Scaffold this active site. Structure first.
Site, PDB file in Angstrom:
ATOM      1  N   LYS A 221       0.748  -1.395   0.173  1.00  0.00           N
ATOM      2  CA  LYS A 221       0.203  -0.044   0.145  1.00  0.00           C
ATOM      3  C   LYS A 221       0.994   1.137  -0.043  1.00  0.00           C
ATOM      4  CE  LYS A 221      -4.483  -1.215   2.202  1.00  0.00           C
ATOM      5  NZ  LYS A 221      -4.974  -1.809   0.858  1.00  0.00           N
ATOM      6  N   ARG A 255      -2.810 -10.004   5.876  1.00  0.00           N
ATOM      7  CA  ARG A 255      -3.294 -10.176   4.627  1.00  0.00           C
ATOM      8  C   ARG A 255      -2.183  -9.578   3.682  1.00  0.00           C
ATOM      9  NH1 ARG A 255      -6.088  -6.866   1.002  1.00  0.00           N
ATOM     10  NH2 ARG A 255      -7.748  -8.160  -0.112  1.00  0.00           N
TER      11      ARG A 255
END
Length: 282
Positions: A221, A255
């Site tokens: 991210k 995750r």
């Protein structure tokens, strides 16, 4: 702690690596299911063999500017894939869907956790979730997840995330979902800027006061792309560093896109916490 779903348990004594399997209209190619179903099952297989214990199947992208998907589009893609996985493998399967009908149908074919980005805020989603009796993950975000507009201002981001989770546990309890079936997610990258994200990572050990499992998803991210100034595919080292900082503090499910490497990092973490007098860094 243990989670029970579909006549099995998931032991959260050690960190779990959750693989990502997105089957959107733009990747689960050429109309409403082609032979992209064997791709999805090949991909599932690799992740399991790289050591992933949960797989997160989602039919809608959560990225800035992502398209809305209709109920039929999602039923067409998600339910095939969740069903074929559950038939062939031992893995736990969570479904990221916001829609009541996809919740109901994915329970019926063997999904173990409902992992909705919108925390069941859509009409009838809480009710459906409750009906299935499955574990549900609650995630903080402010605004619409897929906006391309700037990050909130918060008085204090940690205080606000914490007060959001108190409010959502109550809502879920009022609908008959036991606290014991909840998992919490601070929602990195969703409604937070770079400072807010590292504040939440620095203080992740503090969310254990809820005594609920913590699911975390920092893989590739912007909190990593902006800090190091690299593009989406040169983010591995930084993603592994976030994975390790989270697991050292006791996060139960991580995750990620790079399953092999994270499983390897998690082994070092486990060897280390095993030797630590209290199994957590604070």
């Amino acid at each position: 702690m243990k989670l029970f779903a579909q006549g099995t348990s998931l032991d959260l004594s050690h960190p779990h690596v959750m693989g990502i399997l997105n089957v959107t209209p733009d990747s689960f190619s050429d109309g409403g299911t082609h032979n992209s179903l064997i791709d999805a099952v090949k991909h599932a297989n690799l992740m399991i063999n790289a050591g992933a214990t949960i797989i997160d199947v989602g039919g809608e992208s959560t990225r800035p500017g992502a398209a809305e998907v209709s109920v039929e589009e999602e039923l067409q893609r998600v339910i095939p894939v969740v069903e074929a996985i559950a038939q062939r493998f031992e893995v736990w399967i969570s479904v990221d869907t916001s829609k009541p009908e996809v919740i109901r149908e994915s329970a019926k074919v063997g999904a173990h956790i409902i992992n909705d980005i919108r925390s069941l805020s859509e009409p009838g989603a809480l009710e459906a979730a409750a009906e299935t009796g499955l574990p549900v993950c609650l995630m903080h975000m402010q605004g619409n997840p897929k906006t391309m507009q700037e990050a909130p201002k918060y008085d204090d981001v940690f205080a606000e995330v914490n007060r959001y989770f108190i409010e959502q546990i109550a809502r879920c309890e009022q609908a008959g979902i036991a606290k014991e079936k909840l998992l919490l997610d601070p929602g990195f990258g969703f409604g937070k800027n770079l400072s807010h994200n590292y504040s939440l990572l620095a203080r992740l050990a503090e969310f254990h006061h809820f005594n609920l499992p913590l699911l975390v998803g920092m893989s590739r991210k912007s909190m990593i792309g902006q800090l190091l100034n690299v593009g989406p595919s040169e983010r591995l080292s930084g993603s592994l560093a976030c994975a390790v900082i989270a697991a050292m503090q006791g996060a139960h499910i991580i995750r990620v896109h790079d399953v092999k490497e994270t499983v390897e990092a998690m082994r070092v973490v486990e060897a280390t916490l095993s030797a630590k007098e209290n199994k957590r860094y604070e």
